[PDB]
Amino acid sequence: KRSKENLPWVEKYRPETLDEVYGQNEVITTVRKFVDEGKLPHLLFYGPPGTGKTSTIVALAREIYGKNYSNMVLELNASDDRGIDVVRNQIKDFASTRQIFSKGFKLIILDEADAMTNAAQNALRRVIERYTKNTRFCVLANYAHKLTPALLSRCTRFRFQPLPQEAIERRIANVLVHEKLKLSPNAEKALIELSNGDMRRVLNVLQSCKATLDNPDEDEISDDVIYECCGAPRPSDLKAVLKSILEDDWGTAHYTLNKVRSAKGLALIDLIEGIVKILEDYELQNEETRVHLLTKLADIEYSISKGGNDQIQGSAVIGAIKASFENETV
Amino acid sequence: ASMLEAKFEEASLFKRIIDGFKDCVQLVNFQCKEDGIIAQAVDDSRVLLVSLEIGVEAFQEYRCDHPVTLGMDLTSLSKILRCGNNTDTLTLIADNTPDSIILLFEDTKKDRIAEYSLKLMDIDADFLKIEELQYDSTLSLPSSEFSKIVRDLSQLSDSINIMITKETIKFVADGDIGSGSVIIKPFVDMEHPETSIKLEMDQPVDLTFGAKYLLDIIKGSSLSDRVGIRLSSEAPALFQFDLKSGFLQFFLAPKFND
Amino acid sequence: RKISKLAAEQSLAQQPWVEKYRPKNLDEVTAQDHAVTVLKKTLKSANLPHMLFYGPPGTGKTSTILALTKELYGPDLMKSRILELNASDERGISIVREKVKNFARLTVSKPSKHDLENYPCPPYKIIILDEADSMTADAQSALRRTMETYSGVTRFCLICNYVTRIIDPLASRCSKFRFKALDASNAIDRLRFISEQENVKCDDGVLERILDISAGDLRRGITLLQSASKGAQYLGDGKNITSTQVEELAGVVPHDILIEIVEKVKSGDFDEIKKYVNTFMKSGWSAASVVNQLHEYYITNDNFDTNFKNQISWLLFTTDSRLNNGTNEHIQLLNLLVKISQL
Amino acid sequence: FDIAHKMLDGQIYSDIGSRNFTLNDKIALYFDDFDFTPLMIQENYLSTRPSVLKPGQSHLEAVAEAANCISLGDIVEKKIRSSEQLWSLLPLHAVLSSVYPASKVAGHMAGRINFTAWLGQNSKSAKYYRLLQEIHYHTRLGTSTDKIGLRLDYLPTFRKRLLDPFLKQGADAISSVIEVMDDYYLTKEDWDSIMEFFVGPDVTTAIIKKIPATVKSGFTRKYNSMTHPVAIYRT
Amino acid sequence: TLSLQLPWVEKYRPQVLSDIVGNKETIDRLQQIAKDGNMPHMIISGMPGIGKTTSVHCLAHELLGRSYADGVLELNASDDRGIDVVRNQIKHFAQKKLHLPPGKHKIVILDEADSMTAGAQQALRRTMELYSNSTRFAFACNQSNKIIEPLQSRCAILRYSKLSDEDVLKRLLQIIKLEDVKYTNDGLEAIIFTAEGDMRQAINNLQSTVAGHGLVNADNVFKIVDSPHPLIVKKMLLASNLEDSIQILRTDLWKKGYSSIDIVTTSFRVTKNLAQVKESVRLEMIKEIGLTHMRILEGVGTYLQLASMLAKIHKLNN
Amino acid sequence: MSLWVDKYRPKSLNALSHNEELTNFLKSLSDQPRDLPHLLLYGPNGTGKKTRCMALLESIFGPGVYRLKIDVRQFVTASNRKLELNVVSSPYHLEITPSDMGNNDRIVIQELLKEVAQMEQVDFQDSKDGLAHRYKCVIINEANSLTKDAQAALRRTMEKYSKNIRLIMVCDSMSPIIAPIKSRCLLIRCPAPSDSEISTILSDVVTNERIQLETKDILKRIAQASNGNLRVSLLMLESMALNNELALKSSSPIIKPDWIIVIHKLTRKIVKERSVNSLIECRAVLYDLLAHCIPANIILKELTFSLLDVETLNTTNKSSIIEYSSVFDERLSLGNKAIFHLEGFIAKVMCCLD
DNA sequence: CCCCCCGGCCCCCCCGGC
DNA sequence: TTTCGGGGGGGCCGGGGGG
Numbered sequence A: 001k002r003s004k005e006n007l008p009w010v011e012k013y014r015p016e017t018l019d020e021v022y023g024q025n026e027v028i029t030t031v032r033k034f035v036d037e038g039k040l041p042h043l044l045f046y047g048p049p050g051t052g053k054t055s056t057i058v059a060l061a062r063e064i065y066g067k068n069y070s071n072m073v074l075e076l077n078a079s080d081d082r083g084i085d086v087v088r089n090q091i092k093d094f095a096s097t098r099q100i101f102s103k104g105f106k107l108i109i110l111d112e113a114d115a116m117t118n119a120a121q122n123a124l125r126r127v128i129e130r131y132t133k134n135t136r137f138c139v140l141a142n143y144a145h146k147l148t149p150a151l152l153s154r155c156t157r158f159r160f161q162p163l164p165q166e167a168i169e170r171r172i173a174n175v176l177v178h179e180k181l182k183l184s185p186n187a188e189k190a191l192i193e194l195s196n197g198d199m200r201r202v203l204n205v206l207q208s209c210k211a212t213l214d215n216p217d218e219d220e221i222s223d224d225v226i227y228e229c230c231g232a233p234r235p236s237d238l239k240a241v242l243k244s245i246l247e248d249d250w251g252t253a254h255y256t257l258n259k260v261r262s263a264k265g266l267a268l269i270d271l272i273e274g275i276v277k278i279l280e281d282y283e284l285q286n287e288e289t290r291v292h293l294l295t296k297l298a299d300i301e302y303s304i305s306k307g308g309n310d311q312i313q314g315s316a317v318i319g320a321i322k323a324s325f326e327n328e329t330v
Numbered sequence B: 001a002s003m004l005e006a007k008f009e010e011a012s013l014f015k016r017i018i019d020g021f022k023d024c025v026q027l028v029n030f031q032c033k034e035d036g037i038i039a040q041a042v043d044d045s046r047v048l049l050v051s052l053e054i055g056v057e058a059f060q061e062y063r064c065d066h067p068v069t070l071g072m073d074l075t076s077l078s079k080i081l082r083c084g085n086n087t088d089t090l091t092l093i094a095d096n097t098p099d100s101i102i103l104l105f106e107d108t109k110k111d112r113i114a115e116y117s118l119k120l121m122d123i124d125a126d127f128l129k130i131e132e133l134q135y136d137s138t139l140s141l142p143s144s145e146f147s148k149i150v151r152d153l154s155q156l157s158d159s160i161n162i163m164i165t166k167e168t169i170k171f172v173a174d175g176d177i178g179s180g181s182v183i184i185k186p187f188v189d190m191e192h193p194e195t196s197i198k199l200e201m202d203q204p205v206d207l208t209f210g211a212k213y214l215l216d217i218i219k220g221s222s223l224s225d226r227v228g229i230r231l232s233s234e235a236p237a238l239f240q241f242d243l244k245s246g247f248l249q250f251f252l253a254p255k256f257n258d
Numbered sequence C: 001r002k003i004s005k006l007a008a009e010q011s012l013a014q015q016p017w018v019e020k021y022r023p024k025n026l027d028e029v030t031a032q033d034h035a036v037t038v039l040k041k042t043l044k045s046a047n048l049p050h051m052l053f054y055g056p057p058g059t060g061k062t063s064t065i066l067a068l069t070k071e072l073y074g075p076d077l078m079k080s081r082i083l084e085l086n087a088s089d090e091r092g093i094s095i096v097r098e099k100v101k102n103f104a105r106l107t108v109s110k111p112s113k114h115d116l117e118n119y120p121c122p123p124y125k126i127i128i129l130d131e132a133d134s135m136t137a138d139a140q141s142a143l144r145r146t147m148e149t150y151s152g153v154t155r156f157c158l159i160c161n162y163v164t165r166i167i168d169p170l171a172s173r174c175s176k177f178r179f180k181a182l183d184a185s186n187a188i189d190r191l192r193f194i195s196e197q198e199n200v201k202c203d204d205g206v207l208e209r210i211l212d213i214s215a216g217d218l219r220r221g222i223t224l225l226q227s228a229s230k231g232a233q234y235l236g237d238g239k240n241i242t243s244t245q246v247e248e249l250a251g252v253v254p255h256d257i258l259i260e261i262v263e264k265v266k267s268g269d270f271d272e273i274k275k276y277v278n279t280f281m282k283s284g285w286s287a288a289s290v291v292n293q294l295h296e297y298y299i300t301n302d303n304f305d306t307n308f309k310n311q312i313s314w315l316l317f318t319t320d321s322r323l324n325n326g327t328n329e330h331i332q333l334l335n336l337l338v339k340i341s342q343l
Numbered sequence D: 001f002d003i004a005h006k007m008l009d010g011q012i013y014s015d016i017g018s019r020n021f022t023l024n025d026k027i028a029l030y031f032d033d034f035d036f037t038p039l040m041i042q043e044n045y046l047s048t049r050p051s052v053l054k055p056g057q058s059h060l061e062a063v064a065e066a067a068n069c070i071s072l073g074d075i076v077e078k079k080i081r082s083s084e085q086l087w088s089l090l091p092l093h094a095v096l097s098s099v100y101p102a103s104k105v106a107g108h109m110a111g112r113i114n115f116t117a118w119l120g121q122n123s124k125s126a127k128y129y130r131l132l133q134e135i136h137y138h139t140r141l142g143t144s145t146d147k148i149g150l151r152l153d154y155l156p157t158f159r160k161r162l163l164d165p166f167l168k169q170g171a172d173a174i175s176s177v178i179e180v181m182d183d184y185y186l187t188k189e190d191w192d193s194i195m196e197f198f199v200g201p202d203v204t205t206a207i208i209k210k211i212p213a214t215v216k217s218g219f220t221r222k223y224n225s226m227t228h229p230v231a232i233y234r235t
Numbered sequence E: 001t002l003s004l005q006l007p008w009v010e011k012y013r014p015q016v017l018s019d020i021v022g023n024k025e026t027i028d029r030l031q032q033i034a035k036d037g038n039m040p041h042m043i044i045s046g047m048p049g050i051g052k053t054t055s056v057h058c059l060a061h062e063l064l065g066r067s068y069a070d071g072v073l074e075l076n077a078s079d080d081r082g083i084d085v086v087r088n089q090i091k092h093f094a095q096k097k098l099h100l101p102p103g104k105h106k107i108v109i110l111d112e113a114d115s116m117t118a119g120a121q122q123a124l125r126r127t128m129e130l131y132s133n134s135t136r137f138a139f140a141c142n143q144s145n146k147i148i149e150p151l152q153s154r155c156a157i158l159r160y161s162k163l164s165d166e167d168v169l170k171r172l173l174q175i176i177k178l179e180d181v182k183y184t185n186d187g188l189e190a191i192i193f194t195a196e197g198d199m200r201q202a203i204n205n206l207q208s209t210v211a212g213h214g215l216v217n218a219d220n221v222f223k224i225v226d227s228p229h230p231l232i233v234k235k236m237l238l239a240s241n242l243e244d245s246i247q248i249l250r251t252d253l254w255k256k257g258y259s260s261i262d263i264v265t266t267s268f269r270v271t272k273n274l275a276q277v278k279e280s281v282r283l284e285m286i287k288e289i290g291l292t293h294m295r296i297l298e299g300v301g302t303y304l305q306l307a308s309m310l311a312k313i314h315k316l317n318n
Numbered sequence F: 001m002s003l004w005v006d007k008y009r010p011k012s013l014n015a016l017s018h019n020e021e022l023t024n025f026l027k028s029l030s031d032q033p034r035d036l037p038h039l040l041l042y043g044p045n046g047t048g049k050k051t052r053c054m055a056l057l058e059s060i061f062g063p064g065v066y067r068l069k070i071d072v073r074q075f076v077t078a079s080n081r082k083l084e085l086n087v088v089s090s091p092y093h094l095e096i097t098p099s100d101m102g103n104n105d106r107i108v109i110q111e112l113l114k115e116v117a118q119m120e121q122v123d124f125q126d127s128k129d130g131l132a133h134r135y136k137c138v139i140i141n142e143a144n145s146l147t148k149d150a151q152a153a154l155r156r157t158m159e160k161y162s163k164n165i166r167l168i169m170v171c172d173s174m175s176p177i178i179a180p181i182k183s184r185c186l187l188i189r190c191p192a193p194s195d196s197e198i199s200t201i202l203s204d205v206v207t208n209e210r211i212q213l214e215t216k217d218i219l220k221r222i223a224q225a226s227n228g229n230l231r232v233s234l235l236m237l238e239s240m241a242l243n244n245e246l247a248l249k250s251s252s253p254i255i256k257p258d259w260i261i262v263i264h265k266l267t268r269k270i271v272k273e274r275s276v277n278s279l280i281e282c283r284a285v286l287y288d289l290l291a292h293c294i295p296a297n298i299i300l301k302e303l304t305f306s307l308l309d310v311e312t313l314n315t316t317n318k319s320s321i322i323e324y325s326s327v328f329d330e331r332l333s334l335g336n337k338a339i340f341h342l343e344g345f346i347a348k349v350m351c352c353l354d
Numbered sequence G: 001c002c003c004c005c006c007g008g009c010c011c012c013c014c015c016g017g018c
Numbered sequence H: 001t002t003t004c005g006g007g008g009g010g011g012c013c014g015g016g017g018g019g
């Protein structure tokens, strides 16, 4: 903790103000307008991992209260005890009492509320209702099915979407400026593709790529560096494997799969995912081909998730694809 | 064992100071500088703030080369402190960039030495300067009387309402089984000045506080025989107990009027 | 009575080869450069992220983390800077909430002058959760904010064989490192070095055959090499170790038995297949090895058409999946052989 | 009992009956007593005359389909009560264990509805396994096997060397039985439990009863009139 | 800004029985009871946000007037309600002496009574029986089945029905008139459609839309209120072609950030409540959905698994 | 007196009769036991795995390994339940069967085995080399019955404290053993004895016990009835000798266990009658078998292989039967109540036959 | 120096979906 | 029956205070 330069990039680039949150323009604008005119309702932030929910709520709290926001908000998460007793005593006392420092309203942030017990959620209902005159609640979740309908009825819902490509590009540009790094367009495209809308993945991969370069100042991050550090298949490898499977005979397809995998020690699961993504865009005359492909590939993925023989799994992938595509003739 | 070295002639003083607010907060950051020791903490509910100050005069010997922050857990510190006897001198020792603090109990007459080590914790709670505020009412009264009133009224209800008006202080509680009201007035006696009730009023005040917080606050009555309560309509109540070379302050937020 | 304690080197000299030749520094990790280089650069960068090592058995994950800690802190400062929890310790939600959080919030242990002069000594400690895939979902969820809040003084390492067992938030928080399977192409050098150190004499291609039989697990290969060396030493003839001895030690079915099974399958008679399989099971051959050998024989054969291979691949995959659940080997093998014979 | 009677009624599975008593209603009926509903269904799903058989489908085929679904439901239940505590799977367990098999064989109860017999059998199995473990650890120092191997292989020979002598040589074989018992650290309770394990044509209840009371009295007296060794020394 | 605007759910919370919409017969019965007194033990059950707590509080206020503070004991899930509380505090309140008009009684309001433990409910029985001459009990809950049978026997059952779109529109129009909110018919229709009979949800959505955009029309309402995902799941399951179902899954659910666990649970619920489909087909779809749900719970929560589930469902439907 | 199976059990490596190659391999392993890795002996039941493990221990340490004693260890769960584990120990080795506590076997791995692993050897146990032994041996019987959590707990224990203990795990099948544990062990295949070796052992027993035989062929037949199970063969020989006044004739019949007879009767009933009432009777028979400590997997295997031996069935029926057996064996592996899966298998077989 | 009040462990019993 | 985890209720034990 000697300096902020010792922190992982995922935490060292955490937004500190609402202007540093990208890809959520609608939500940010709406919440900013709510706070500007003092019309903030009870909030719910529902979204997938690493979309900026915790960052957004912390930035909102800092904007409302300034730098000394921690002492004027009650933050609870899955690492802390949040039983029914906690709701009855600590949350109730915080909601029913005035602020120590200022005379403003009070904010309670229940981060990762989907891990809360049903009893605590039920106890929270009348607490939210009775003290809404001076207190507001913010809930954060990845899974909505864990939240009771009563709690959802009292909150205004905001959905955090997977980060758009432009936002990831802007954040990558800022990180490159700060770190004095160079990135090629192909490397950026590959990084965005593997991100799947999660900023933390982008930042971790960028840190690994920087660590990989012999000379981070002069060297530039190329797609080869990304593929090496992540140990992921190249698009050319996937195309070659799929072409061999579809066109060549069994012996040649087996040889090609083995050679491609052994060239860089690729994992079979990554190849399966890439081939599924490629085949999604394929136009199939018969729906039965799609049915067979999806079912068999899902079965193989589930089997791989538990281990098993790798060579047999690869042969199973080859055979499943061949059998499924045999239905495009008649 | 040279960076910070502080000595208490009697270990009972530090134990009593710690026990004054050990039940209010759990994690405390003690900041030690050449002028003495300070500490500020906020309870889990964020309703009560504890501020402790101890000056150099309270120590037989005190040396602090550079400012040092030490994060401690209250229950562990109290458990270590209760080991020492009342006739043994206490010494707090810390090194540069310490990961722990050493407590040494010495008994020269019996040549008894007891060393304890407490691991420190990283607390990101910066010292919040409490800007001085003008208060509508300031009343100083014996600690025992306030403790008795709080203990009596807390039985009837979970909230205690304090009203200060012209030459009168009223404590009221209303509960399921009944209600209670205690009225006191300013009074000065030269024969027994320690029992005097002093009141200075500018505007009348009326504030409601949680009973449990007051029960925790009154635990500092051992430190000082008198307690000073400062109340304002727009500020949290301030309960101060005066030490020989320092003070212990409790800032309590009142309940919302609704 | 009592026995004088043995020296560290003396004690290690009489350990099993897998433990005896465990890597001691990051330079001794064989074929994980794509991640080892990134880890090594942190010795100077001093911004180590949260790490999620995942990979198949015996690839060098635990060794890698131990070597990294050794290089970062040194023999004296390691213990005070490391907290290790694995599947042999209780790791319930309460444990995560209390003990892990308490260790994560502690101030870092004070480095000594020698440690500062000799080692980088980064300003944070490390919590290793080995076999993290055995932890429940709720316990994992309890770590999410602990990882982020105390990242200034603590870093987390989660090691697993099945990455899917880690909840998505934790995987997002951690930087992922995939450990590749160790085969004859990328792990031959280490095995040859070990054999030379132990003075093991073998025919050409024996080490390659050992690594091929191991199928990505270097621990298994080292154990097989130690077994072969013990056999050769006991024999006393001084002859080079041969591939046949290695195969016998590894439980590989002889080629003649496999050909007999293939011929019985080709015949197609249920009674003959059942009788032969009943006789075969008495030898104690592992069903997984038999299935692997049959897959190798059938897939790489030019005498079978595309449809036959398409069907047999799925049959073998189904049998392997069923065997992975701990099923009766006899029944599964008989079913597989009958189904193949009906193709 | 009422849950079993209603769930197995064929009217609620018809086109008209399904719109009045919906699938949600059947799931709620299961949730009335989730603990006992699957057991009752499994107990009583073979004792109905169905009225929902599809054209060309026999009673046996529907019974087999219901049994397959019940097995899948048992797997799901094992999943629910594991270390992961996947209680959110309870609704699915309702469909697989009760609703689907019942819909496969829904009709009119061909006879009296019977309470599940699985709990008593489970208790009996636990008792017998405890007895087997006690016997195994009494004879561990002599034998070379696990408890299962003891039950499947050793027990018949022990019967031949423990019970047959009484039936063949009368009361003159008490000494040999006692010698064998001592050699394996067996006690009288162990003898009785061993005799209580056999099934099929090897049942010993009638054979034991037919033995003259004098022979049993003499055996007990001889056993009580001497010292015997102890395998496990408790302290 | 440190100032807060009072939510319209609280500002326009009905204060009298005549301001509550829906369940006309029950409201009239409560009005008659308030006029004549002799309120009996009652249990009010219904779906969230339909005016149960409002009804109970209004009835108590009209019944007691100035004595409300002394003669009402309110306990909910946020307060301590253990067996000790029932045995001491509630008993003390029941035995309390309080002079009241010749047709009024003390009232104990146990809100969210379905969360109370069995022991407390059992202890309440003789307390209700013995002190009924001066005290009456009003339970409010979402599921009346959680209340033990002896307590139900002692109380009058009042099952609240869902609010029709007419009543929601009527209340929304009153609030709009009282607040001078510019709106359009399409916006109000969208708000009502998204509310699904939840008055609290409708009012909150209206207030949020007004705050965030000013004019209440369909575009702004849908920007503030997302289209419920259960309808999207139902459309996905009812698609004729596998390609259309996969399109809906990938565009309207997966790319919007909905988790796989949420998607599979919603699919299970929608399939359960799919009356248009034959029950046996629904059972097969539920079997497939349960297989997928178990796979996701194990840890494989991928888009491929959901696509495979859709493929199996379509194969069954064909 | 003591049964012939126990009385004549070899107590040394040089006393082993069958599988000379395995004996030589074990001798090679015991030649330099200081760096011996963990061992996993897998093979068919009743072949001599435990005998070979004991012989290896005797060769490493000495005859004292055979002086065994039994003690009781107490364990407490999170629910405060008290469990007792019977530990068989010698001055050099310790034996455990954690599966005895079912799902609580993990406890044994976390507390007992870890406790033993953290204790160093201090008693002066002089070895053949000249110095004292440095590790103790821990035998885990029925290792394939351990829960996955117990094996996971074993994972790091075997590695951290390998200098203090060495593990020997005996199993009838490696399929339920997780991959990391197999990676951590030296695998040893234990083939069943041949018919001739079984005949030789039986002839030696007969000569020692003075049993009259009309011809040697009788022993051969017993071996054929054993199907490679030496323990079963010896017990059957003793039973036949007792039944025939210690005189075996060529016409003496082969004695089968009671549960085998019950399963054969059930198979005949299934073949004869295919009806729901027959299914109810089959359920009653299955309950009777289960209540008397007959494992479900054994029942399924025996029933399948008895059905496959029926001469009236055609190839299609046998193929369907074996497929159903595979499916329901998997179900039993992943299931809890075995009766459900057994009844499902019987119903499917009945449908296929009809 | 002894008795009583009252906070905190310790244990044991019971849901767990909507 | 029951493989975690949460909640509740009752029983002692012991610190502190009072007489």
Ligand SMILES: Nc1ncnc2c1ncn2[C@@H]1O[C@H](COP(=O)(O)OP(=O)(O)OP(O)(O)=S)[C@@H](O)[C@H]1O
Binding pocket: A009, A010, A011, A013, A014, A015, A020, A021, A022, A023, A024, A047, A048, A049, A050, A051, A052, A053, A054, A055, A056, A141, A142, A171, A199, A200, A203, C144, C168, C169, C172
């Ligand atoms: N919209 C964003 N803009 C910039 N950085 C982001 C954004 N979202 C995520 N990040 C980055 O990823 C890190 C984590 O962001 P978070 O706000 O914690 O995401 P999250 O949605 O709260 O994750 P979960 O739901 O707890 S798994 C931040 O410190 C940022 O560095």
Ligand SMILES: Nc1ncnc2c1ncn2[C@@H]1O[C@H](COP(=O)(O)OP(=O)(O)OP(O)(O)=S)[C@@H](O)[C@H]1O
Binding pocket: C017, C018, C019, C021, C022, C023, C028, C029, C030, C031, C032, C055, C056, C057, C058, C059, C060, C061, C062, C063, C064, C160, C161, C190, C218, C219, C222, F155, F179, F180, F183
């Ligand atoms: N990359 C490697 N380089 C050198 N030796 C290795 C390597 N991987 C495995 N080994 C050897 O095998 C032994 C075990 O290696 P480990 O680091 O324990 O593998 P692992 O991936 O942690 O095993 P799991 O996942 O717990 S089954 C080491 O002591 C080494 O002797």
Ligand SMILES: Nc1ncnc2c1ncn2[C@@H]1O[C@H](COP(=O)(O)OP(=O)(O)OP(O)(O)=S)[C@@H](O)[C@H]1O
Binding pocket: A125, A150, A153, E008, E009, E010, E012, E013, E014, E019, E020, E021, E022, E046, E047, E048, E049, E050, E051, E052, E053, E054, E055, E141, E142, E171, E199, E200, E203
């Ligand atoms: N019939 C109604 N008429 C007018 N407003 C209503 C009505 N029902 C609900 N509301 C409004 O929504 C707010 C909440 O109503 P409640 O009475 O709390 O509903 P509820 O059914 O008790 O909620 P639950 O069951 O505790 S989740 C009221 O203050 C009203 O502003």
Ligand SMILES: Nc1nc2c(ncn2[C@@H]2O[C@H](COP(=O)(O)OP(=O)(O)O)[C@@H](O)[C@H]2O)c(=O)[nH]1
Binding pocket: D144, D145, F005, F006, F008, F009, F010, F015, F016, F017, F018, F044, F045, F046, F047, F048, F049, F050, F051, F052, F201, F230, F231
């Ligand atoms: N004469 C002789 N008997 C053996 C030999 N191996 C095993 N046996 C006998 O076979 C019995 C069963 O052996 P055991 O190890 O318990 O079977 P397993 O552990 O299930 O493989 C033993 O009691 C011995 O009597 C051998 O090599 N020679």
Ligand SMILES: [Mg+2]
Binding pocket: A053, A054, A055
């Ligand atoms: Mg977050």
Ligand SMILES: [Mg+2]
Binding pocket: C061, C062, C063
């Ligand atoms: Mg490892």
Ligand SMILES: [Mg+2]
Binding pocket: E052, E053, E111
């Ligand atoms: Mg309500």
